[PDB]
């Protein structure tokens, strides 16, 4: 018989004593050791003193689970420990001072998401996302990538969209202070102004150029008259301009970072473009610098503080 520790958050540890006769699944229930499902493994002698992850079996550990993860989904813990099993085996090299991921199990969209988050100002609501965020910026993003897969309901090897991944992450972040008012000018319906807050205030699908969104885009109205939806005010620390993959010229200093997508729908590859003193191209561990860039771009990230248009 040995003494081990069970926890749901790895912050509040609960001490337990197990017996060699019964497996972990008998006493604790579903138990995981650093990602490995040890529900069907009997306690070995080298397990004394180690910390174990267990699904909440009483109301005390149910609350500790929400305090750290902000979810009551029982399958969340299983998916998270399943994703951690391959993410802890990935390589996370430092590419130009940023933490990237070497290609493995179709993680090109995770590497682009990781590199992007290190360049935008974001505060996660779940403490598990925030603590792993800080650890990712240091250079240990294994737990962070596992949580992204869990929160996005994706599995390892699955094909993921960087915009959809960011969309899920923004809903678990504090964007309540973000606002965006728009003005749609219709030739028949007249003038109508809407106001977006939260996640829908920092994302737009249709164009990549933030200047074009300021000048106005042609969106169809119900009567057929193409309204010129232009941005009026934007109080957000960043904006994401998304558009279907198309050839786009990127210039250093005009944007923060971009997502390159090459290949067919869903079965393709993601490369991350970032702007410094010169344009950099990060593909896993590979790095390519250039003064100009032209290629297929799906998302472009810009910086913002407090903007008000000059169009009436
Ligand atoms: C790589 C990947 C994984 C999953 C995925 O799941 C989409 C389904 N999800 C609604 C749940 C999508 C993709 C993916 O391929 N992603 C890129 C950025 C992409 C490619 C294309 C292409 C068209 C022709 C050749 S490549 C189009 C898009 C669009 C996004 C929004 C649109 C509005 N019409 S088109 C995105
Ligand atoms: Cl919540
Ligand atoms: Cl949340
Ligand atoms: Cl910018
Ligand atoms: Zn407790
Ligand atoms: Zn929450
Ligand atoms: Zn949630
Ligand atoms: Zn693997
Ligand atoms: Zn694996
Ligand atoms: Zn109209
Ligand atoms: Zn890939
Ligand atoms: Zn490139």
Coordinates of C-alpha atoms and ligand atoms in Angstrom, one line a residue:
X1 CA 0.0 0.0 0.0
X2 CA 1.3 3.4 -1.0
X3 CA 0.2 7.1 -0.5
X4 CA -0.6 9.2 -3.6
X5 CA -2.3 12.5 -4.3
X6 CA -5.5 13.1 -6.3
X7 CA -6.6 16.4 -7.7
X8 CA -8.8 17.9 -10.4
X9 CA -6.9 21.2 -10.8
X10 CA -3.3 20.3 -9.8
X11 CA -3.5 23.3 -7.4
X12 CA -5.6 21.8 -4.6
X13 CA -4.1 18.4 -3.9
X14 CA -6.0 15.7 -1.9
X15 CA -4.0 13.0 -0.2
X16 CA -5.1 9.4 -0.5
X17 CA -3.8 5.9 0.3
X18 CA -4.3 3.0 -2.2
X19 CA -3.9 -0.7 -2.0
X20 CA -1.9 -3.0 -4.3
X21 CA -4.7 -5.5 -4.7
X22 CA -7.2 -3.1 -6.3
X23 CA -6.6 -1.0 -9.4
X24 CA -7.0 2.8 -9.5
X25 CA -10.3 2.4 -11.2
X26 CA -11.7 0.6 -8.2
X27 CA -10.9 3.2 -5.6
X28 CA -10.5 6.6 -7.4
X29 CA -12.5 5.7 -10.5
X30 CA -11.2 7.1 -13.8
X31 CA -7.6 8.1 -12.9
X32 CA -4.9 9.7 -15.2
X33 CA -1.2 10.0 -14.6
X34 CA 0.3 12.9 -16.5
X35 CA -2.0 12.0 -19.4
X36 CA -1.8 8.2 -19.2
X37 CA -5.1 6.6 -18.4
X38 CA -4.3 4.5 -15.4
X39 CA -7.9 3.4 -14.7
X40 CA -6.9 -0.2 -15.5
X41 CA -3.4 -0.2 -14.0
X42 CA -2.7 -1.4 -10.4
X43 CA -0.6 0.8 -8.2
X44 CA 3.1 0.3 -8.8
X45 CA 5.8 0.9 -6.2
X46 CA 7.2 3.9 -8.1
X47 CA 3.8 5.7 -7.9
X48 CA 4.1 6.5 -4.2
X49 CA 4.2 10.3 -3.8
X50 CA 3.0 11.2 -7.3
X51 CA 0.0 13.4 -8.1
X52 CA -3.0 11.9 -9.9
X53 CA -5.9 13.4 -11.9
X54 CA -9.3 12.0 -11.1
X55 CA -12.8 12.7 -12.2
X56 CA -14.9 14.5 -9.5
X57 CA -16.5 11.9 -7.3
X58 CA -18.0 14.3 -4.7
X59 CA -19.3 17.8 -4.6
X60 CA -16.0 19.3 -3.2
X61 CA -14.0 18.2 -6.3
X62 CA -16.8 19.2 -8.5
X63 CA -16.5 22.8 -7.4
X64 CA -12.7 22.8 -7.6
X65 CA -13.1 21.6 -11.3
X66 CA -15.3 24.6 -12.2
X67 CA -13.0 27.1 -10.3
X68 CA -10.2 26.1 -12.6
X69 CA -11.8 25.1 -15.9
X70 CA -15.2 27.0 -16.0
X71 CA -17.1 23.9 -17.2
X72 CA -19.3 21.2 -15.7
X73 CA -18.8 18.9 -18.7
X74 CA -17.7 15.5 -17.3
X75 CA -16.1 14.6 -20.6
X76 CA -13.9 17.7 -20.5
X77 CA -11.4 16.1 -18.1
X78 CA -11.1 13.0 -20.3
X79 CA -10.6 14.9 -23.5
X80 CA -8.1 17.2 -21.9
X81 CA -6.0 14.3 -20.5
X82 CA -6.3 12.5 -23.8
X83 CA -5.0 15.5 -25.7
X84 CA -2.2 16.0 -23.1
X85 CA -0.9 12.6 -24.0
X86 CA 0.4 13.6 -27.5
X87 CA 1.0 17.3 -26.7
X88 CA 3.5 16.5 -24.0
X89 CA 5.4 14.5 -26.7
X90 CA 5.5 17.4 -29.2
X91 CA 8.6 19.6 -29.6
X92 CA 8.1 23.4 -28.8
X93 CA 11.1 25.2 -30.3
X94 CA 11.7 28.9 -29.8
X95 CA 11.4 30.6 -33.3
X96 CA 12.4 34.3 -33.2
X97 CA 11.6 34.6 -29.5
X98 CA 8.2 33.0 -30.0
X99 CA 7.1 29.5 -28.8
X100 CA 6.1 27.4 -31.8
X101 CA 5.3 23.7 -32.3
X102 CA 7.1 21.2 -34.6
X103 CA 4.8 19.5 -37.1
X104 CA 3.0 16.5 -35.5
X105 CA -0.5 15.1 -35.7
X106 CA -1.8 17.9 -38.0
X107 CA -1.0 20.6 -35.5
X108 CA -0.3 23.4 -38.0
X109 CA -3.4 25.2 -36.9
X110 CA -2.3 24.9 -33.3
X111 CA 1.1 26.3 -34.0
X112 CA -0.4 29.3 -35.8
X113 CA -2.9 29.8 -32.9
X114 CA -0.1 29.5 -30.3
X115 CA 2.2 32.0 -32.1
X116 CA -0.7 34.4 -32.6
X117 CA -1.8 34.5 -29.0
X118 CA 1.8 35.4 -28.0
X119 CA 1.4 38.6 -30.0
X120 CA -2.1 39.8 -28.9
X121 CA -3.3 41.0 -25.5
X122 CA -5.7 38.5 -24.1
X123 CA -6.9 37.6 -20.6
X124 CA -8.5 34.1 -20.3
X125 CA -11.4 33.6 -17.9
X126 CA -10.6 30.0 -16.9
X127 CA -7.6 30.0 -14.6
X128 CA -6.4 26.8 -16.3
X129 CA -6.2 28.7 -19.6
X130 CA -4.4 31.6 -18.0
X131 CA -1.8 29.6 -16.0
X132 CA -1.0 27.5 -19.1
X133 CA -0.9 30.7 -21.1
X134 CA 1.8 32.1 -18.9
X135 CA 3.6 28.8 -19.0
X136 CA 3.3 28.8 -22.8
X137 CA 4.9 32.2 -23.1
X138 CA 7.8 30.9 -21.0
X139 CA 8.3 27.9 -23.3
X140 CA 6.2 25.1 -21.9
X141 CA 3.0 25.1 -24.0
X142 CA 2.3 21.3 -23.6
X143 CA -0.5 21.8 -21.1
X144 CA -1.7 24.9 -23.0
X145 CA -2.2 23.1 -26.3
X146 CA -3.9 20.2 -24.6
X147 CA -6.5 22.6 -23.1
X148 CA -7.1 24.3 -26.4
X149 CA -8.1 21.0 -27.9
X150 CA -10.3 20.3 -25.0
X151 CA -12.1 23.6 -25.0
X152 CA -12.5 23.5 -28.8
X153 CA -14.0 20.0 -28.7
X154 CA -11.2 18.9 -31.1
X155 CA -9.2 15.7 -31.0
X156 CA -5.5 15.2 -31.8
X157 CA -5.0 14.8 -35.5
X158 CA -8.3 16.4 -36.4
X159 CA -8.3 19.2 -39.0
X160 CA -8.8 22.6 -37.3
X161 CA -9.6 26.1 -38.5
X162 CA -7.5 28.8 -37.0
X163 CA -10.4 31.3 -37.0
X164 CA -12.7 28.7 -35.4
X165 CA -10.0 28.0 -32.8
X166 CA -9.7 31.7 -32.0
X167 CA -13.4 32.1 -31.9
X168 CA -13.7 29.4 -29.2
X169 CA -10.8 31.0 -27.3
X170 CA -12.3 34.5 -27.4
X171 CA -15.6 33.2 -25.8
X172 CA -13.4 32.0 -22.8
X173 CA -11.7 35.4 -22.6
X174 CA -12.6 38.8 -21.1
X175 CA -13.7 40.8 -24.1
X176 CA -16.5 42.6 -22.3
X177 CA -14.6 45.9 -22.5
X178 CA -14.5 45.5 -26.4
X179 CA -17.1 47.4 -28.4
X180 CA -17.6 48.0 -32.1
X181 CA -20.3 50.1 -33.7
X182 CA -21.1 49.8 -37.4
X183 CA -23.1 51.9 -39.8
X184 CA -24.9 50.3 -42.8
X185 CA -26.1 52.8 -45.3
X186 CA -28.9 51.5 -47.5
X187 CA -30.2 53.4 -50.5
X188 CA -33.8 52.3 -49.8
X189 CA -34.0 51.3 -46.1
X190 CA -32.0 54.4 -45.1
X191 CA -29.3 54.5 -42.4
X192 CA -29.1 51.9 -39.7
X193 CA -26.4 51.7 -37.0
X194 CA -25.7 48.5 -35.0
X195 CA -23.4 48.0 -32.0
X196 CA -21.4 44.8 -31.3
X197 CA -19.7 43.9 -28.0
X198 CA -17.6 41.0 -26.8
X199 CA -16.4 38.4 -29.3
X200 CA -18.4 39.6 -32.2
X201 CA -16.8 43.0 -31.8
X202 CA -13.3 41.8 -32.6
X203 CA -13.9 39.4 -35.5
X204 CA -15.1 40.0 -39.1
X205 CA -15.4 37.7 -42.0
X206 CA -15.2 39.1 -45.5
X207 CA -12.0 41.2 -45.9
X208 CA -8.4 41.2 -44.8
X209 CA -7.6 44.9 -45.0
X210 CA -8.5 46.9 -41.9
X211 CA -8.4 50.0 -44.0
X212 CA -11.1 48.5 -46.3
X213 CA -13.3 47.8 -43.3
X214 CA -12.9 51.4 -42.3
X215 CA -13.6 52.8 -45.7
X216 CA -16.6 50.4 -46.1
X217 CA -17.5 47.0 -47.6
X218 CA -20.5 46.2 -49.9
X219 CA -22.9 43.9 -48.1
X220 CA -26.3 43.0 -49.6
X221 CA -29.4 44.3 -47.8
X222 CA -32.8 42.6 -47.8
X223 CA -34.2 44.9 -50.5
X224 CA -31.2 44.2 -52.7
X225 CA -29.4 47.6 -52.2
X226 CA -25.8 47.0 -51.4
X227 CA -25.1 48.8 -48.1
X228 CA -21.7 50.2 -47.4
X229 CA -21.0 48.8 -43.9
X230 CA -18.1 50.9 -42.6
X231 CA -16.6 50.9 -39.1
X232 CA -17.5 53.9 -36.9
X233 CA -15.9 53.2 -33.6
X234 CA -13.6 50.4 -32.3
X235 CA -12.6 50.1 -28.7
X236 CA -10.6 46.8 -28.6
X237 CA -6.9 45.9 -28.0
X238 CA -6.9 44.1 -31.4
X239 CA -9.0 43.1 -34.4
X240 CA -9.1 40.0 -36.5
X241 CA -9.8 40.4 -40.2
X242 CA -10.8 37.1 -41.7
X243 CA -11.5 36.2 -45.3
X244 CA -11.4 33.1 -47.5
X245 CA -7.9 32.2 -48.6
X246 CA -6.7 34.6 -51.4
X247 CA -3.5 36.1 -52.7
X248 CA -2.6 39.1 -50.5
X249 CA 0.5 41.3 -50.3
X250 CA 1.8 41.8 -46.7
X251 CA 4.1 44.7 -45.8
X252 CA 6.2 44.9 -42.7
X253 CA 4.7 47.4 -40.1
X254 CA 1.2 47.4 -41.5
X255 CA -0.1 44.4 -39.4
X256 CA 0.8 42.3 -36.4
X257 CA 0.6 38.8 -37.7
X258 CA -1.2 36.7 -40.4
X259 CA -2.4 33.2 -41.2
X260 CA -1.2 31.6 -44.5
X261 CA -3.3 28.7 -45.7
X262 CA -2.1 26.6 -48.6
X263 CA -3.9 23.6 -50.1
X264 CA -7.4 22.2 -50.4
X265 CA -10.3 22.9 -48.1
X266 CA -9.7 21.2 -44.7
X267 CA -6.9 19.0 -46.1
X268 CA -4.2 21.8 -46.2
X269 CA -1.4 23.4 -44.2
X270 CA -1.1 26.6 -42.0
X271 CA 1.9 28.9 -41.9
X272 CA 2.3 31.8 -39.6
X273 CA 3.5 35.3 -40.8
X274 CA 4.6 37.9 -38.3
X275 CA 5.8 41.5 -38.7
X276 CA 9.0 42.7 -37.0
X277 CA 11.9 44.8 -38.3
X278 CA 11.3 42.6 -41.4
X279 CA 8.6 40.0 -42.3
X280 CA 9.1 36.6 -40.8
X281 CA 7.6 33.2 -41.9
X282 CA 7.3 30.6 -39.2
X283 CA 6.5 27.0 -40.3
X284 CA 6.8 24.8 -37.2
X285 CA 10.6 25.1 -36.4
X286 CA 11.5 26.6 -39.8
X287 CA 12.0 30.4 -40.1
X288 CA 12.1 32.6 -43.3
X289 CA 12.6 36.3 -43.3
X290 CA 11.8 38.6 -46.2
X291 CA 11.2 42.3 -46.9
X292 CA 8.0 41.7 -48.8
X293 CA 5.4 38.9 -48.9
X294 CA 2.7 37.7 -51.3
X295 CA 0.7 34.6 -50.7
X296 CA -2.6 33.1 -49.6
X297 CA -3.8 34.7 -46.4
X298 CA -7.0 33.9 -44.4
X299 CA -6.6 36.0 -41.2
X300 CA -4.7 39.2 -40.5
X301 CA -4.3 40.6 -37.0
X302 CA -4.1 44.4 -36.4
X303 CA -3.5 46.4 -33.2
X304 CA -6.0 48.9 -32.0
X305 CA -6.7 51.2 -29.0
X306 CA -9.6 53.7 -29.5
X307 CA -10.6 54.6 -33.0
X308 CA -13.4 56.9 -34.3
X309 CA -14.2 57.3 -38.0
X310 CA -14.3 60.6 -40.0
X311 CA -17.2 59.7 -42.3
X312 CA -20.7 61.1 -42.2
Ligands
LIG1 C1 -8.0 23.4 -42.3 C2 -9.4 23.4 -41.9 C3 -9.9 22.6 -40.9 C4 -11.2 22.6 -40.5 C5 -12.1 23.4 -41.1 O1 -13.4 23.4 -40.7 C6 -14.4 24.2 -41.4 C7 -15.7 23.7 -41.0 N1 -16.3 24.5 -39.9 C8 -17.5 25.3 -40.3 C9 -16.6 23.6 -38.7 C10 -11.7 24.2 -42.2 C11 -10.3 24.2 -42.6 C12 -9.9 25.1 -43.7 O2 -9.7 24.7 -44.8 N2 -9.8 26.4 -43.4 C13 -9.3 27.4 -44.4 C14 -8.8 28.7 -43.7 C15 -10.4 27.7 -45.4 C16 -10.2 27.3 -46.8 C17 -11.2 27.6 -47.7 C18 -10.9 27.2 -49.1 C19 -11.8 27.3 -50.2 C20 -11.3 26.8 -51.4 C21 -10.0 26.3 -51.2 S1 -9.5 26.4 -49.6 C22 -12.3 28.3 -47.4 C23 -12.5 28.8 -46.1 C24 -13.7 29.5 -45.7 C25 -14.0 30.0 -44.4 C26 -15.2 30.7 -44.4 C27 -15.9 30.7 -45.7 C28 -17.2 31.3 -46.0 N3 -17.6 30.9 -47.3 S2 -14.9 29.9 -46.8 C29 -11.5 28.4 -45.1
LIG2 CL1 -18.1 30.2 -17.4
LIG3 CL1 -15.0 31.0 -19.6
LIG4 CL1 -0.9 47.0 -36.7
LIG5 ZN1 -10.8 20.1 -1.2
LIG6 ZN1 -16.2 31.4 -17.6
LIG7 ZN1 -17.2 27.2 -22.1
LIG8 ZN1 0.8 11.5 -31.5
LIG9 ZN1 0.8 10.0 -29.8
LIG10 ZN1 -32.4 47.9 -47.6
LIG11 ZN1 -0.4 20.7 -41.2
LIG12 ZN1 6.6 31.3 -46.2

